[PDB]
Inverse folding.
């Protein structure tokens, strides 16, 4: 049909797995089990096109990060996730983007910046800060909550729409 390989990256605990599971399985994972490397597949209609999403959920914990680069290499677009209550995860985004560019050997890779956990109130990253970072990269910024499902479909579908502009 039409396949899009999406890779979700970002610091440990920011909600990469919760986001992916909300999209694919329609429930919220409350517990924290660090990921090594997991894959999901779903057929969905996006803007009138039937397509197959292959989503790679990657490790954010350094200790679990072995060989992540080898998984990142096959990606067609990347969700770069931080949590709005985790300033360090936002600062880390630069390093994840740089890794993406290294493994893709390109400065032109479809990406979306995602600020997750927007249901929480201990915000330390303001929307405008993230919008500015995204603007510097030439990509959209979207806020999500894996818990309430706010923005979850939007983030992944926006990434598909970015891949289509490549
Ligand atoms: N309130 C709230 N909690 C969230 C949200 N997303 C994830 N969490 C919580 O944050 C914790 C970590 O989520 P998880 O998805 O495992 O993070 P991760 O980025 O996949 N971690 P890792 O890189 O180690 O695999 C879990 O307790 C999960 O319930 C969110 O949008 N809101
Ligand atoms: C480490 C954060 C800096 C952002 C650079 C694009
Ligand atoms: C501090 C996170 C950087 C990730 C690059 C492998
Ligand atoms: Ca649950
Ligand atoms: Ca390389
Ligand atoms: Ca390469
Ligand atoms: Mg995970």
């Amino acid at each position: 049909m039409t396949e899009y390989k999406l890779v979700v990256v970002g610091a440990g605990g920011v909600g990469k797995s919760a986001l992916t599971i909300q999209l694919i399985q329609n429930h919220f994972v409350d517990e924290y089990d660090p990921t090594i490397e997991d894959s999901y597949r779903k057929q969905v209609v996006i803007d009138g096109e039937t397509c197959l999403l292959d989503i790679l959920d990657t490790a954010g914990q350094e200790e679990y990060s072995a060989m992540r680069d080898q998984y990142m290499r096959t990606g067609e677009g990347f969700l770069c996730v931080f949590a709005i209550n985790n300033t360090k995860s936002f600062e880390d985004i630069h390093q994840y983007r740089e890794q993406i560019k290294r493994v893709k050997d390109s400065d032109d890779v479809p990406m979306v910046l995602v600020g997750n956990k927007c249901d929480l109130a201990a915000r330390t990253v303001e929307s405008r800060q993230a919008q500015d970072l995204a603007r510097s990269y030439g990509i959209p910024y979207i806020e999500t909550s894996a818990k309430t499902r706010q923005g979850v479909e939007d983030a992944f579908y926006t990434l598909v729409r970015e891949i289509r502009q490549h």
About this structure: The beta strands are 3-10, 37-46, 49-58, 77-83, 111-116, 141-143.
